[PDB]
Amino acid sequence: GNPVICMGHHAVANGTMVKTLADDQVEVVTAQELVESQNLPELCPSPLRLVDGQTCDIINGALGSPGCDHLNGAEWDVFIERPNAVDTCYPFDVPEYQSLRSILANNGKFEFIAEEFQWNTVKQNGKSGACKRANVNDFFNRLNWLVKSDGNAYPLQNLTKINNGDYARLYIWGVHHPSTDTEQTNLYKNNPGGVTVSTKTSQTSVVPNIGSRPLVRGLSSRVSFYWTIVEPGDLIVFNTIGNLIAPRGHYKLNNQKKSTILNTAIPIGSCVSKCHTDKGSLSTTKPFQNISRIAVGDCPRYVKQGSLKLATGMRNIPE
Amino acid sequence: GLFGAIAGFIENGWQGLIDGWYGFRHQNAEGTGTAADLKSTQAAIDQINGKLNRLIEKTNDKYHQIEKEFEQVEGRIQDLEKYVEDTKIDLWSYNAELLVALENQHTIDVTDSEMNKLFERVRRQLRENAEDKGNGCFEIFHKCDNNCIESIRNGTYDHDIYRDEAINNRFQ
């Protein structure tokens, strides 16, 4: 009596090293990489809606700077802001810049509603050579530059916009900063000027600053931009004795704000992906990625490791 | 492996076994053969693709977050933003490292387990007609032609058929 039967398992010539709790290098027959380390050299325009700012960043888009007209009516899941975006208008600053940029980005649309402001004797539509539009002196197309009458009057301004619609409104308004008191006086007569924007629940007051400032786009003067959100049932009051860069209306806010912004130079292609990094879209089923902590959409989780191998087979012991 | 089969009492795997993870290798009077075991193979495969699927596709659908790159320091607020992100990344990297280590330790034990189950199943079919040689092989103490071998492989082997022949060979 001597037939023999043996029970055994498969093997291959060269398997894959994996880690366990116990051992850092164990050879198994097959394994699968869980960290995505390759990205597409482009951003996928589907199935998320990407809006390419091109030359305008999102703040300049909102203000209506020249070159930003392609952003009118734009709706996005992800606003693509370009590193080489260029200023094309009056030198300006925004005191809570990142906060405004967040609101605009999160909101997800540029839907502007023109409104009629009955500014008193003051003259409207001040323009500049710092803000040329089609080689003609111009300004932010969402803003209205008010100055004294020809008969040197800047009467205290005071008009009111009432929100009785079914959506919160965003008003963007500014304050002008002359480089001289002469400059101040030839513009607004009054010195100092001043703005107070009020709602039922808030009032915001700005006193203009006059000083020598670096030449930006051939100017030493500046505009500072502010914003006011007016919920339905509330309203907004504008008050000026000089220096107001007035709104021409309001942007619409969504009730639910679900969008965001991505700053990257990566071109938009023709691929399909729901995961976007600042280095390009990912096309993967892996649960992790080491490409960038900056990631928007339906993405793998960002980790530090370059590789994590999951065993998908038994230990490899050949011969 | 907790069971000591793979890289244990089975000294190595079979590169010639290419149509299954586990199988049988026999030698009788008419020759030798190697055949895959479907049920043990499928059990191991089912338990592994199961892990794969629980892993691949969960939900990290994120839009508006926080800024994560900064040109110049600003102080307190920026420090917090960077600290939150760095904290978040270390925790997830830890989770990923531990997950893969646990899963792999489990996968190796499972595959070692299925090997042992297959061995134990065959042992039970063979009753008193065979003896463990210690290397994952049974010495069969009766003539066992190809049909006989196949009956052990498909689970129709009837030990009573050969018992008298086998007992006599083992003990005299």
Ligand SMILES: CC(=O)N[C@@H]1[C@@H](O)[C@H](O[C@@H]2O[C@H](CO[C@]3(C(=O)O)C[C@H](O)[C@@H](NC(C)=O)[C@H]([C@H](O)[C@H](O)CO)O3)[C@H](O)[C@H](O)[C@H]2O)[C@@H](CO)O[C@H]1O
């Ligand atoms: C206003 C006046 O009576 N003085 C005239 C000066 O405007 C002018 O001074 C030069 O001004 C240069 C740029 O002028 C601008 C501009 O930004 O394009 C011209 C705009 O039309 C004007 N916008 C208004 C009045 O709403 C704008 C504005 O005053 C300032 O931007 C506010 O700071 O001025 C630049 O500053 C030059 O360095 C300067 O020589 C002189 C000389 O051309 O003519 C005056 O009649």
Ligand SMILES: *[C@@H]1O[C@H](CO)[C@@H](O)[C@H](O)[C@H]1NC(C)=O
């Ligand atoms: C303007 O201001 C006056 C007081 O100065 C206030 O009573 C009135 O409600 C305001 N009206 C408008 C049109 O803004």
Ligand SMILES: *[C@@H]1O[C@H](CO)[C@@H](O)[C@H](O)[C@H]1NC(C)=O
């Ligand atoms: C991601 O992992 C690969 C190796 O898998 C490595 O070459 C690359 O440097 C890693 N990326 C980063 C940003 O560290």
